[PDB]
Structure 1
């Protein structure tokens, strides 16, 4: 198997559907799915603790070092609720999943988030923080917002991205 394969970033507020989409994409394309939070947990890539948010702080440099070789080889779908620290060269396309605030709140409430965590996350979405972070970090032409409210939308997202992957592979393996 000697094909050039693309790298895809799935970003957006926690709860929007990144993991659901990334896992389905991996199963249906054979690309490797990487959950950055899970990777950080497995490889213990943390430095410091945030007092106000009550969470260990992701060690961004170590995450980058951990992933770099694999990213260089291509064919990776990366899922994280942040994107400014990734090398720009990693990604061929970046999707920012978006979820209506009312819908997102019900999802995050079901997760058992307390009030402070619910509020911070919900404001993150309503202020469009990750969308702005993606646009600030990557070329406008490769950043796309995806609706992620209903199963029908997940289905459309899977379909559109699978079609994009197929076209990209053709274009970069002449």
Structure 2
């Protein structure tokens, strides 16, 4: 991989849409580094404050940015998070918003053991297309793409499409 310019990819979308499964499979099949922002925040303890209504530690967004910046500047990172407005715009060469039909998403999150309030908030997040709108507000329209993510076959299509995109980008940016 040495001395190749490599792209950064954002995988965003509501919890349950398949970002982690996709990012991990992409890392394995491309050699790009996969970063789960939730796991990173947990591992490096990047929390500040507690949201009492959602019942979750509040992400320290500045510290996440500081934690990742050097690595992002070096390129070749696939970032997975259910938020994107706080990342420096310069980080990402392409942004994929994974989408899952509400019925499918509900059953996924139900299986994850989400209670009613958490199920409702997340399901409304998807049905209101919150993350999609957040992505389009934060990044150039031409680099934001929605990906259906409802079944293994769509995961397969997404892996294939993005792996092909990575190859083309690398060719274009290492003349």
Q: Taking structure 1 as the reference length, what is the TM-score of the superposition? A: 1.00
Task: Quote the residue 2:75 is aligned against.
Answer: 74
Distance 2:31 2:158 in 1: 17
Structure 1 residue 50, shift from structure 2 partner: 0.2
Distance 1:56 1:94 in 2: 26
Distance 1:66 1:150 in 2: 33
Task: Quote the residue 1:28 is aligned against.
Answer: 29
SS of the residue 1:81 aligns to: coil
For structure 1, the 5+ residue unaligned runs are none
Q: Taking structure 2 as the reference length, what is the TM-score of the superposition? A: 0.99
Distance 2:87 2:33 in 1: 17
Distance 2:19 2:99 in 1: 10
Structure 1 residue 101, shift from structure 2 partner: 0.1
SS of the residue 1:13 aligns to: coil
Structure 1 residue 78, shift from structure 2 partner: 0.0
SS of the residue 1:47 aligns to: strand
Structure 1 residue 28, shift from structure 2 partner: 0.1
Aligned-CA RMSD value: 0.2
Q: Deviations over 1:45-78 (max 9, x none)?
A: 0000000000000000000000000000000000
Task: Quote the residue 1:130 is aligned against.
Answer: 131
Structure 1 residue 140, shift from structure 2 partner: 0.1
SS of the residue 1:41 aligns to: helix
For structure 2, the 5+ residue unaligned runs are none
Structure 1 residue 137, shift from structure 2 partner: 0.1
Distance 2:151 2:105 in 1: 11
Distance 2:52 2:24 in 1: 32
Q: Deviations over 1:119-143 (max 9, x none)?
A: 0000000000000000000000000
Q: Deviations over 1:90-124 (max 9, x none)?
A: 00000000000000000000011000000000000
Structure 1 residue 85, shift from structure 2 partner: 0.1
Count of aligned pairs between the two proteins: 174
